[PDB]
């Protein structure tokens, strides 16, 4: 039922590595402070995404057993998860509580950031669905770790080695869902279901970025490696 001493250790370890990310307040304060042009917002996005991938590699490297994996599989796992991890972190930031009216302005500013209309609606649909689950910081951290250690990514040679690293994280998350929400036994399944919705963002991410209302779409050499751009 309750977490074991080893599971408690694993959870705290994951939490500490996860907390090394850029604070949600930093991002929302910038967006809420003043309205930017689509050109300025494209550049804010690429700088945010470059910092996010850098921190995500550092978080991934600390995941227990990640270093024992085949080097080609390590690259396949990171490249297969980076976009989903960015959207999950964006969903976490979006659902953080702010003073009355602030989340409405934040949404309005993001809707008018330069992103094409067809990509706006499914993004906020996913963000608001994540929000209804009322996830704790521990649930976002474990779910990010579960996203990274997905054995069903394209080009994985040893899927069973990946399965073995993901299984203890799914077990901790399942126990946490039963503890945080004991009235809702569907909570764990709802979280896993949200991961299938996350995968849809991969298929159109490159198109989403190239459709941004700017004259030129400049990306950093690291973003070109993780994204299907330039």
């Amino acid at each position: 039922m309750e977490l074991t001493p080893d599971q408690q250790t694993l959870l705290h370890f994951i939490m500490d590595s996860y907390n090394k990310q850029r604070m949600p307040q930093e991002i929302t304060n910038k967006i809420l402070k003043e309205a930017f042009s689509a050109e300025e917002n494209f550049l804010i996005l690429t700088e945010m995404a470059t910092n996010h991938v850098q921190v995500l590699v550092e978080f991934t490297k600390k995941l227990p057993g990640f270093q024992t994996l085949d080097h080609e599989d390590q690259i396949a796992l990171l490249k297969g998860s980076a976009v989903e991890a960015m959207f999950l972190r964006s969903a976490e930031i979006f659902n953080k509580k702010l003073p009355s009216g602030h989340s409405d302005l934040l949404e309005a500013r993001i809707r008018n950031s330069g992103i094409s209309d067809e990509y706006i609606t499914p993004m906020f649909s996913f963000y608001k669905s994540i929000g209804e689950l009322k996830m704790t910081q521990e649930e976002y951290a474990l779910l990010t770790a579960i996203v990274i250690l997905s054995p069903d990514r394209q080009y994985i040679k040893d899927r069973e080695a990946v399965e073995k690293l993901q299984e203890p994280l799914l077990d901790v998350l399942q126990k946490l869902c039963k503890i945080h929400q004991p009235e809702n036994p569907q909570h764990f399944a709802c979280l896993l279901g949200r991961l299938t919705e996350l995968r849809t963002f991969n298929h159109h991410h490159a198109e989403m970025l190239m459709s941004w209302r700017v004259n030129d779409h400049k990306f950093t050499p690291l973003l070109c490696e993780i994204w299907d751009v330039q």
Binding site: Q54, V57, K61, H71, Q74, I75, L78, K79, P221, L222, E225, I226
Partner: peptide, 11 residues
Amino acid sequence: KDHQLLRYLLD
């Protein structure tokens, strides 16, 4: 080789 920066950050 492709993903040279990722391979670098990983190692």
